Specification:
Helix content is 6%, strand content 32%. By secondary structure, it is mainly beta. It has a 7-stranded antiparallel sheet, covered by helices on one side. A 6-stranded antiparallel β-barrel has the order 9-10-11-14-13-12. The protein is globular and about 45 Å long. It binds glutathione. Glutathione binds next to loops. This is ST14 protein.
Length: 241
């Protein structure tokens, strides 16, 4: 996250860190039930050096604050049983950039570990609404990951404006969130984490999944996120949640 601040300990108890064995933190995810996470499909694609698609290659840390303190009280370590990447994902366009991760043993709910609420299929997160991005990604483009979980406040951008900022790249699964003036944005290593939106009684709902961007925090280049209401039924069908 560029332009953000340190989160308070336990402020985002649905935020999860996904480590690939031997490589440290790669992506984020969100806790949605005792057994399931939501993340981004693009994080789980094999390359010639490493099989990112193989669930046995990963560790999820729940309740984490600081990447240098992964055994702190309240942090839970879990392996993955399965990675379900959306069947329509493609790694060229990044359309359908969403995956479901099945924990190998359930999470234990606590003050540090709590699921995010999922929005119904019909719910609209309106243009202009302030929402939050969180993660351990880079704090400047090309820069370094944060040890401490970061948060940043960003606003939903109108879809036609988003399309025109990133021509021939924005599908209806995507939404731009940020500022035309730049300054606050997601960045490398934030992918897969949740957008958190404060709803009408103060409960937080997941608005989207950190997906991609052109650079980070640049003028006229807000980050791109996968919309969540579109996938509510797909989540139910694949997870029972
Ligand atoms: S909607 C998912 C979360 N709800 C719960 O974990 C219910 C737990 C207890 N029954 C309770 O204390 O009410 C949730 O509300 N997450 C978002 C949030 O803002 O905390």
């Amino acid at each position: 996250v560029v332009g953000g601040t340190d989160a308070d300990e336990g402020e985002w108890p649905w935020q999860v860190s996904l480590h690939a064995l031997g490589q440290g933190h790669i992506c984020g995810a969100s806790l949605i039930s005792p057994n399931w996470l939501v993340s981004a499909a693009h994080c789980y694609i094999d390359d010639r050096g490493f099989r990112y698609s193989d669930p046995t290659q990963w560790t999820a840390f729940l309740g984490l604050h600081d990447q240098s303190q992964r055994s702190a009280p309240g942090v839970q370590e879990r392996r993955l049983k399965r990675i379900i990447s959306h069947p329509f994902f493609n790694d060229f366009t990044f359309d359908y950039d969403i995956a479901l991760l099945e924990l190998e043993k359930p999470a234990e709910y606590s003050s540090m570990v709590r699921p995010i609420c999922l929005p119904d299929a019909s719910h609209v997160f309106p243009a202009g609404k302030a929402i939050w991005v969180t993660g351990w990604g880079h704090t400047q483009y090309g820069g370094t990951g944060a040890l401490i979980l970061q948060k940043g406040e960003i606003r939903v951008i109108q879809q036609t404006t988003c399309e025109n900022l990133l021509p021939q790249q924005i599908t209806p699964r995507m939404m731009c969130v940020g500022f035309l003036s730049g300054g606050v944005d997601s960045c490398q290593g934030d992918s897969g984490g949740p957008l958190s939106s404060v709803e009408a009684d103060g409960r937080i709902f997941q608005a989207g999944v950190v997906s991609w961007g052109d650079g980070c925090a640049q003028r006229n280049k807000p980050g791109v996120y996968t919309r969540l209401p579109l996938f509510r039924d797909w989540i139910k069908e694949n997870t029972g949640v």
